[PDB]
Structures are given as C-alpha cells and as structure tokens.
Design a binder for these strands. Structure first.
Lengths: 117, 117
RNA sequence: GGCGAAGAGCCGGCGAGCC
RNA sequence: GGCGAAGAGCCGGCGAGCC
C-alpha cells in the first residue's frame, strides 16, 4: 500500500472542510491527472490522497513526487468524501489546493499540523 | 454537387495507378482530416476527392480550400477505389500526394491535364 | 433513470491499429 | 471475424460534460 502515515480523523475533517471552503474562493484541482500535473508544474499547495483507492497504482506514485517537490499531502478515508469536498458528483482519488484564496491562516495552521506528524 | 468539374474515367484510372505506385517511393496522406490539414499547411502537391462521399459535408470544404491554397485537385468515382489505391482496408474520402518521390514529371503532366479541364 | 475526476467530451501532434 | 481514414489507438493540452 501507498499510505505512508496515519492521519487523525478530526484533522481529516479539518482538511475536507477547508477544501470545501477553498473551492469557493480559491482554485482546486480534482482527479489524479490534474493533481499530479499541478504538482509537477510546481503549482500545488496541498494535495489530498484518499486511502481506499484500488488498485493502489492509481495514486501510488503521487506521494513520492510530492516528497521530491516538498509539497505537503494528506490522507482522507474515502474517495467519496474527497469527491464530495471537491463537488464533482463522483468519487475522487486525489485533489489539490492550488490557490488558498482568503484562507491564508486556516491553510497555514493545517500544513503546520501535517508536517508536525 | 460539390464536384466542380467532370473528370474522364481514364484520367481517374491514371490518377489512381500513379497514386498506387507513389505510396512506394513518395509520401501520401490518407483520410480527409490528414489531407485537409496537409493542404492547408501548404505541403500537398495533389489531392484526390471521392465523388460518392456521404454525407457530402465531409469533403465539401476541400475543393475551395485547395483553390485558396493553389493546390490542384482531382475527382475519382468511388471512395473504395481511392481506399485501395492508398492501401488501407476501409474506404477513404480524400487523399494527397505531398512528395512525388521518383515521379516528378508524371505528377506535373497529370496536373497540367487537370488544369486543361 | 444511464455513463463520467479509475477522466467527460472537445483540441493539438502522430496517422493503423484495437477487441 | 467485430470496430476502424466518416479516424484506430498512442502522446500532449483543457478540465465536466456526454446519453
């Protein structure tokens, strides 16, 4: 499996709520192709990788590229929750915040919390 | 009809035979999408348009585009004859010789006779 | 009701392969 | 054999639309 570490549920809820609100005033990429290219292009501020993705090879490359580019990434239980948070009626294996909009502080606190684990 | 002039049957046979041999030492584009783009790009020396194409709007733009680009064009009865001559296993609505290989004079003479119509 | 971020369809490049 | 130059599939691009 591609999941490198365990994320507390309340921090996950914080992450998806943040993603929901960011879609309103920022820019988010949704889907593994858009997310990976956004990371590769140097644009991603925070990427989300679902934990129930099968086969794992859809997203298994995503964590290492994110490590090489020093871009924080977080895990969420279900592709359904991530799909709901980006608001595209279907499950979603990975996503990314590209522009934090007006949610400077909330994003900053969240990313400090990911690096702290 | 999108057929701008009448092409004698014997000129059709000469044209398809020459095209047949040209695939071997020259270069031919096959299908309307490739041919139209190649003429528009200015590389095509001579294009073939089947007369039994349906619906006609598939190839109806080619004659005038070829005129705009000053490219000589000839008509052949059936997309079947053109498809066999360009050597595919399905019908073909239009084609083009872009580089004459070893047939410089033959292509030139053919084009003069086409202008003669 | 169906399909769809496990990528919709559309575009550029190649231009005969896929089951 | 079915589909296929009326564009097969591969690559790049946009990134939610098509039945």
């Amino acid at each position: 499996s591609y999941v490198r570490f365990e994320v507390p549920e309340d921090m996950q809820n914080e992450a998806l709520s943040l993603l929901e609100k960011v879609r309103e005033s920022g820019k988010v990429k949704k889907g593994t192709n858009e997310t990976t290219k956004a990371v590769e292009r140097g644009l991603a501020k925070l990427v989300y990788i679902a934990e129930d993705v099968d086969p794992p090879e859809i997203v298994a490359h995503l964590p290492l590229l994110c490590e090489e580019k020093n871009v924080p990434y977080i895990y969420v239980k279900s592709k359904n929750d991530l799909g709901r948070a980006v608001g595209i009626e279907v499950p979603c294996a990975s996503a990314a915040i590209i522009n934090e909009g007006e949610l400077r502080k909330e994003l900053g606190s969240l990313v400090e919390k990911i690096k702290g684990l």
